[PDB]
Amino acid sequence: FCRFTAEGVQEIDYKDIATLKNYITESGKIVPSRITGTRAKYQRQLARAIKRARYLSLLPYTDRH
Amino acid sequence: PRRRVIGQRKILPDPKFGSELLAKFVNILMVDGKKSTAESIVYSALETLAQRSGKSELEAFEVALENVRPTVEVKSRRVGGSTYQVPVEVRPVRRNALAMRWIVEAARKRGDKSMALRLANELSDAAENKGTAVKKREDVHRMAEANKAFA
Amino acid sequence: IKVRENEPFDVALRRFKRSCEKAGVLAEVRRREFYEKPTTERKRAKASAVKRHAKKLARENARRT
Amino acid sequence: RKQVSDGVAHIHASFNNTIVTITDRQGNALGWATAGGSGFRGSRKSTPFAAQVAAERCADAVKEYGIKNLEVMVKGPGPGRESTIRALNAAGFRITNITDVTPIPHNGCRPPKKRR
RNA sequence: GCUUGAGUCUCGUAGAGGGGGGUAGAAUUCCAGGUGUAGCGGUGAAAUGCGUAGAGAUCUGGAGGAAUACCGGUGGCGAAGGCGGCCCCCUGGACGAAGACUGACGCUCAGGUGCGAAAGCGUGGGGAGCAAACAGGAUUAGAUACCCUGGUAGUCCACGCCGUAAACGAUGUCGACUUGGAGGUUGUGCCCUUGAGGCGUGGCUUCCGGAGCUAACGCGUUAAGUCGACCGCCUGGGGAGUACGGCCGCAAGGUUAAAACUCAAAUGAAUUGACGGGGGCCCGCACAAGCGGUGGAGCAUGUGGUUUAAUUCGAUGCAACGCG
RNA sequence: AGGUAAAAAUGCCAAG
């Protein structure tokens, strides 16, 4: 329920891969904004940035290859 | 059933030598309420074994009892899609229940010439883990291993 | 999905599977298209969300608890 | 015979079917058996207890290869998913891990419409 | 003429808005071979089939079409139909902040015009999966259906056409006015941003409820409340949105649209009782758990079925069959 | 607080 960006104003980059991995479960699956309870507008910045990482294989689409 | 959990009674200590556990052997051997005949046979058995083995009387029900000691068995959880067996934790009353029951399955079969004949032998047979009684628990065990390491 | 808890698990301990997408989700995209039963279903699904929501706050009378 | 000392039990435990595939880490088949091979006509081969025993008839044919350890991969929800591993945790095998390699798609292989 | 209507500019705004071009990964289908091999696959039970000519399974490599799990949320955008993997090029609308300017430049609208799910049609490609047609196999008293297995166009891309759907919040378009609450979503102003906030304001927006309204259900500042403007439209059901004629279309048909004839109703709302091859919870040796009989056999005895010139007849899921 | 699960063989019809 981290009050992340409602008080953490900036653009969510994919470069901060350390921060980025905190939103994907161990099984690759990206976790919904419901559990983390943060704002969808902010969470919107997440999913697109995810595929940017997914496209670069910086992270996995799904680990079992 | 669907209502009040019933209990027990005041089980009488044996009017020969006060004891309750063996009193259920009467119950777990009784057929058609023939007590005196049971008093005839049930008695005949123990004293001769006490005489034959050489130890005390009320340590004869025990000498056999060591290797017939059960702990668990199966009580399957067939929810409606999985009739897979689930072993049960056989609680004291539940434990001694099947216990005096194993003296039944053993003695009732292979009738040599008389009840006390087999019963006395089965006792000391049960005392050395080489007879019918002792394995009666063992057989139960091997149909429980079927499933292991559950949660 | 990938459980090998170093050495001492020695039992199922496969919550990693059941917690994310164990075959129940396979048994969610089983066999049927519809396009729409879920279109309708999401609406009715969420329907329960607000009414059950009420059940927790609309239970506030005496009722002799 | 080449006598490999490690292997993998793939298991195709589908809704109404269960086949066990113990191969090595190179895909060459070591030993395979199923609940289907146990006969278990039609409906009856769908029971978890069925697959367990079939695994007992499947834990062999690898001992002849010097098999030591193994990892389990099962697919298909149906019955099982654990039935065999229970019969595999004690099949006489130092098991390393168990994984679910299930094919999660991403919306587009059109699935059948049956069962009305 | 002025400006409280309406219209544009300066600065920001989120979004599956729309057209087009490249590209990622999972998955399935198929090819090639390795290992290995009696099954695979199916279900109500199967059988059809695929199989020792060596599949299934599994693995490496390769050939393809097609849609985008998770995110994802009565979340968002769009006139509606509708639209989401990623990436880029062209490009629409809607909202906010303070002023600038124009100076009623409005609203609605016959006919006209543009868009407009699927299925379908024409022309040329493509053709994984799915799958009308279809056949084989099941089921059935029948089963040209539901189920299994293959399987065709289509589904998919491009260029035209068809213009209809439960195209439905079943509610037209535009403006004003009349209690609040819960929020959600998306910009912004003030204060101690002392903290995920406190105090207002713009829009879209989901549910709840005031007066009122309504036949009721329910709607309720998102009105079906209180008025105004304008327009489409209705007059019992059926016949029939059908025929004939006109227009539009390659066709399918679409569109505008009757009458004769027939009935005394058709229709909505609601709740009692009933029913449910509908459920939520509780209850009885209903079962569990156990005790010990019946089902084997002999015989008693009843019943049925048989047989007999005649072998009286009633009772025959539960609630008849050592019953009258 | 709270969220999956679950069986689906077949059986038609009415003069007071």
mmCIF file of C-alpha atoms in Angstrom, chain C residues 2-35:
data_model
loop_
_atom_site.group_PDB
_atom_site.id
_atom_site.type_symbol
_atom_site.label_atom_id
_atom_site.label_comp_id
_atom_site.label_asym_id
_atom_site.label_seq_id
_atom_site.Cartn_x
_atom_site.Cartn_y
_atom_site.Cartn_z
ATOM 1 C CA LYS C 2 10.170 -23.118 -9.444
ATOM 2 C CA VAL C 3 10.423 -24.476 -5.930
ATOM 3 C CA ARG C 4 13.622 -26.069 -4.626
ATOM 4 C CA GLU C 5 13.770 -24.489 -1.077
ATOM 5 C CA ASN C 6 17.370 -25.325 -0.544
ATOM 6 C CA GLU C 7 17.369 -28.620 1.101
ATOM 7 C CA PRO C 8 14.720 -28.902 3.860
ATOM 8 C CA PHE C 9 11.417 -28.500 2.084
ATOM 9 C CA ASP C 10 11.249 -32.265 1.311
ATOM 10 C CA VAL C 11 7.477 -31.916 1.027
ATOM 11 C CA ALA C 12 5.193 -30.107 -1.435
ATOM 12 C CA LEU C 13 5.539 -26.555 -0.011
ATOM 13 C CA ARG C 14 4.454 -25.481 -3.490
ATOM 14 C CA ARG C 15 2.569 -22.333 -2.520
ATOM 15 C CA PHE C 16 4.788 -20.621 -5.142
ATOM 16 C CA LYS C 17 2.595 -22.453 -7.621
ATOM 17 C CA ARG C 18 -0.834 -22.130 -6.032
ATOM 18 C CA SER C 19 -0.346 -18.551 -5.053
ATOM 19 C CA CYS C 20 0.206 -17.185 -8.474
ATOM 20 C CA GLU C 21 -1.438 -19.080 -11.368
ATOM 21 C CA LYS C 22 -1.567 -22.785 -10.573
ATOM 22 C CA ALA C 23 -3.632 -24.688 -13.153
ATOM 23 C CA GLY C 24 -6.731 -23.092 -11.926
ATOM 24 C CA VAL C 25 -6.076 -20.299 -14.361
ATOM 25 C CA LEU C 26 -5.484 -22.908 -17.088
ATOM 26 C CA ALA C 27 -8.898 -24.143 -15.889
ATOM 27 C CA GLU C 28 -10.004 -20.516 -16.439
ATOM 28 C CA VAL C 29 -9.052 -20.178 -20.163
ATOM 29 C CA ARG C 30 -10.065 -23.777 -20.744
ATOM 30 C CA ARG C 31 -12.207 -24.033 -23.799
ATOM 31 C CA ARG C 32 -14.654 -21.358 -25.009
ATOM 32 C CA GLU C 33 -14.427 -17.945 -26.654
ATOM 33 C CA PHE C 34 -17.684 -16.076 -25.769
ATOM 34 C CA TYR C 35 -15.928 -12.749 -26.072
#
